[PDB]
Design a protein around this ligand. Sequence first.
Ligand SMILES: Clc1ccc(-c2cc(C3CCNCC3)[nH]n2)cc1
Lengths: 251, 29, 10
Amino acid sequence: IVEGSDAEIGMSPWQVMLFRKSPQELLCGASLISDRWVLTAAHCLLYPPWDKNFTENDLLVRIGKHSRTRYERNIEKISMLEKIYIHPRYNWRENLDRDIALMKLKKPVAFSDYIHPVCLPDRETAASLLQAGYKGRVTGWGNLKEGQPSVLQVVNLPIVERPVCKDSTRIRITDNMFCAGYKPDEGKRGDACEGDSGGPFVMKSPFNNRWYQMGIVSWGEGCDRDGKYGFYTHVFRLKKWIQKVIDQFGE
Amino acid sequence: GEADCGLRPLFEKKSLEDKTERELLESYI
Amino acid sequence: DFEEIPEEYL
Ligand SMILES: Clc1ccc(-c2cc(C3CCNCC3)[nH]n2)cc1
C-alpha cells in the first residue's frame, strides 16, 4: 500500500495472507468470507505468462495477522488448502477480466477478535454504494513504494467514474472491473502496490453498519502514479459464480 | 451471507469506531 | 525475511 497508514488491531479481521511454503514468502492478500472459504484474485494462483500455476500444496493462508513477517503466536491461525477454484472465464491472456478465485480450507478456522468474515454484497448494496466519489478501503502488506511495511497498511480511496478509468489506460476495461484512486487535482494520494493484489476493497454500508467486500485488488500500471488508477475485480458481478462454487463444493 | 458477517469484534460489536471509517461515511452523499 | 512458522504447518 502506497501512502497509507498502519492498520489498527482488529481493523480488518477478514484480511488473509496468501503465503508460499517454499520459499517462505508473501504472495498476495485474500479475504475470509466464511469459516472455510477465502476469496482472492485468480492471478495470485494462475498466471501462465510468468509460469505461475500453484497447486493446493504449494500454499498456506495466514488469518488474523497484523505484523507482516512475525509469527503471531496465539493470534494468527495458519490453514492448509483443500481445493482451489479459478473462475472458468478468467482472462489471463488479455486483461485479467474476471480476476477472482476461491480457496476452500481443509478445516474451519475459529473466529476470534482478530479473525472474522466480511460480507458479500447483494444487488442493492452494490447499486447503492458503487458510485463515483464513494470511498472504499484497501488493506495489505505490499510494497510502500513503486520499501516493505512492518504491519498491515490501510488506505481509503474513492471510486472513479468509468470514462475516467477507461481514459487512463490502453487496457480494455470490462464491466467486471472498476477503478479507484485520487485524481492529480484532488491532491490526496494512495494506491495498492506489489503484494497487495488479491486483497479486499471494502465499504461500510451506512444502512446496516456492516462491511461489504466490493472489490478485489486486481491490477495497476505502477503504484500511486498521477493520472493512473488501481483496478479492482467487481465482486457483485461475479457473485453467481461464487455462490455456485460454494453451493456445490461447500458443506 | 453469514448472519454476523461484516461486524468486527473490536469495533462494531463493542460500538467503537476506527480512526478513518468516518471518511468513508462522509463520502456517501 | 519471514519468521519461521511452526513446522506442523509445512
Ligand atoms: Cl489495484 C492495484 C494497484 C497496483 C498494483 C501493482 C503494481 C505493481 C508493480 C508491478 C511491477 N511494476 C511496478 C508496479 N504490482 N502490483 C496491483 C493492484
